[PDB]
């Protein structure tokens, strides 16, 4: 893993991963990450930005698992 | 292959500061992992072929030939 894109991520320029904006980063993490590894990497994978779109479906996610990770049901949520 | 198949790889790998592996992991990238899950799909359960789609794809043999 790297953040290196961060610098780009913080564009906000859409949800998706823009092209020459993603490019700038894989360029920076060559020069801050010696190529000779992603040379032989099977790809470099970049992610989604977690949009208000992302996140209303997220949310439902986490808390879901957040509560069912809550030791026993001796309570628990009805989650309205 | 032909010519383009391989023309692709060259041309949309041949960067002069790369070493011949990305050519290799541009291919697996490309159209391996893509008949990797053609056979899980059953698209490809025997033979295979190599077609050329500009970007690039793979063909399949759909009737699980």
Same mark, same amino acid.
């Given at each position: 893993?790297?953040?290196?894109?961060?610098?780009?991520?913080?564009?906000?320029?859409?949800?998706?991963?823009?092209?020459?904006?993603?490019?700038?980063?894989?360029?920076?993490?060559?020069?801050?990450?010696?190529?000779?590894?992603?040379?032989?990497?099977?790809?470099?994978?970049?992610?989604?930005?977690?949009?208000?779109?992302?996140?209303?479906?997220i949310?439902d996610?986490?808390?879901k698992?957040?509560?069912?990770?809550?030791?026993?049901?001796?309570?628990?949520?009805?989650?309205? | /292959?032909?010519?383009? =198949?391989?023309?692709? $790889?060259?041309?949309?790998?041949?960067?002069?500061?790369?070493?011949?592996?990305? %050519?290799?992991?541009?291919?697996?990238?490309?159209? /391996?992992?893509?008949? =990797?899950?053609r056979? $899980?799909?059953?698209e490809?359960?025997?033979?295979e072929?190599?077609?050329?789609? %500009?970007?690039?794809?793979?063909?399949?043999?759909?009737?699980?030939?």
């Amino acid at each position: 893993t790297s953040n290196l894109g961060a610098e780009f991520i913080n564009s906000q320029q859409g949800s998706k991963i823009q092209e020459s904006t993603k490019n700038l980063v894989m360029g920076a993490v060559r020069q801050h990450f010696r190529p000779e590894f992603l040379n032989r990497i099977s790809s470099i994978v970049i992610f989604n930005k977690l949009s208000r779109k992302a996140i209303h479906k997220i949310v439902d996610i986490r808390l879901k698992e957040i509560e069912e990770r809550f030791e026993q049901n001796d309570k628990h949520y009805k989650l309205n | /292959l032909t010519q383009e =198949a391989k023309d692709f $790889l060259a041309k949309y790998g041949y960067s002069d500061d790369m070493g011949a592996r990305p %050519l290799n992991r541009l291919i697996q990238n490309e159209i /391996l992992n893509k008949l =990797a899950l053609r056979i $899980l799909k059953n698209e490809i359960k025997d033979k295979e072929t190599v077609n050329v789609v %500009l970007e690039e794809c793979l063909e399949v043999l759909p009737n699980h030939e």
